[PDB]
Design a protein around this ligand. Structure first.
Ligand SMILES: O=C(O)c1cc(-c2ccc(CNC(=O)c3ccc(-c4ccc(C(=O)O)o4)cc3Cl)cc2)n(-c2ccc(Cl)c(Cl)c2)n1
Length: 123
């Protein structure tokens, strides 16, 4: 309904990347999903997600959840609650967030637009 950004967990992205908070179950919007280059293994999906204030592209989907993308329940504009995630830090210092359990609260078709005016999160 009205005040759409109020439907998203504003500040959750900073909390994940700054505080290292993994107990929260934030509500985020999917902005984009694309496959990464994989090879001889199951496909892997990378997501640009929004908390209403920030976007962050460092999300990857657990392979067990691939059917959500491939059957189109999880797609651009949908609003999701993250029930379980883990953070991994690469050798170069970048962090990636692996989404392990995810619930779609509102379908892409029921939302239909990017909520608010989130800006890219910096490191
Ligand atoms: O081609 C490409 O375009 C491509 C490639 C990559 C890529 C980069 C790093 C890695 C290293 N691997 C992991 O950080 C990892 C750790 C645990 C798990 C896991 C635990 C349980 C499960 C499960 O149940 O599925 O998965 C998964 C991963 Cl993928 C891999 C790819 N990237 C990429 C670059 C920069 C960012 Cl910020 C991101 Cl998000 C992705 N792009």
């Amino acid at each position: 309904g009205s005040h759409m950004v109020g439907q998203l967990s504003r500040g959750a992205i900073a909390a994940i990347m700054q505080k290292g908070d993994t107990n929260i179950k934030p509500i985020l919007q999917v902005i984009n999903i694309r496959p990464i280059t994989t090879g001889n293994s199951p496909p892997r999906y990378r997501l640009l997600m929004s908390d209403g204030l920030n976007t962050l592209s460092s999300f990857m989907l657990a392979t067990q959840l691939n059917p959500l993308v491939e059957e189109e329940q999880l797609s651009s504009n949908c609003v999701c609650q993250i029930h379980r995630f883990i953070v991994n830090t690469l050798k170069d210092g970048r962090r990636v967030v692996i989404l392990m359990e995810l619930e779609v609260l509102k379908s892409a078709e029921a939302v239909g637009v990017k909520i608010g005016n989130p800006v890219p999160y910096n490191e």
